[PDB]
Amino acid sequence: EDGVDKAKIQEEITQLKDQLTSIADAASFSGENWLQADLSGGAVTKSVVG
Amino acid sequence: VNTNGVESQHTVAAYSLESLTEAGAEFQGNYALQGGNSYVKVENVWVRA
């Protein structure tokens, strides 16, 4: 909506992005969070003893 | 590994990185050149190439 100011929404999305980063980094169990992996090789695979 | 346009499943022996690095293996990216044999890394394990 063009009549709505975009700055307030700007810090709203900034706070939401910080929240997303906190979700991504905090959600871990024992060092293997299964998220925020290193994609230098692009084929990281994690396994569970079945 | 797909030999042709169609995919397929293959079984190949895996070699530990410690075994390669113990015998004086040159490395570059995902390549190993311990001796005459050449090893590459596919996802996490080194296999003969």
Q: DSSP letter at B43? A: S
Distance linking the first and last C-alpha atoms of chain A: 52
B-chain residue closest to A44, CA distance? B43
Kindly report the backbone phi and psi dihedral angles of residue B27, in degrees, each rounded to the nearest multiple of 5, phi listed first: -130, 150
Give the gap in angstroms from C-alpha B30 to the nearest C-alpha of chain A: 9
CB atoms within 10 A of CB B17: 15
Q: Choose from B43, B45, B47 for mutation: most chain A CBs within 10 A.
A: B43
**CB-based contact, B29 to chain A, within 8 Å:** no
Resolution to one decimal, Å: 3.5
In terms of C-beta distances under 8 Å and separation of at least 24 residues, what long-range contacts does A42-45 make, across chains too?
A43/B42, A43/B43, A43/B44, A44/B44, A45/B43, A45/B44
In terms of C-beta distances under 8 Å and separation of at least 24 residues, what long-range contacts does B6-13 make, across chains too?
B12/B47, B12/B48, B13/B47, B13/B48
CB atoms within 10 A of CB B21: 13
Of B19, B46, B45, B49, residue with least CA distance to B36:
B49
Residues 6+ apart with CB under 8 A from B49: B38, B39, B40
Method for this entry: cryo-EM
A45 vs B30, B41, B43: nearest CB: B43
Calpha distance B36→B17 (Å, rounded): 17
**CB-based contact, B44 to chain A, within 8 Å:** yes
Judged on CB neighbours under 10 Å (0-12, 13-18, 19+), A37 is: exposed
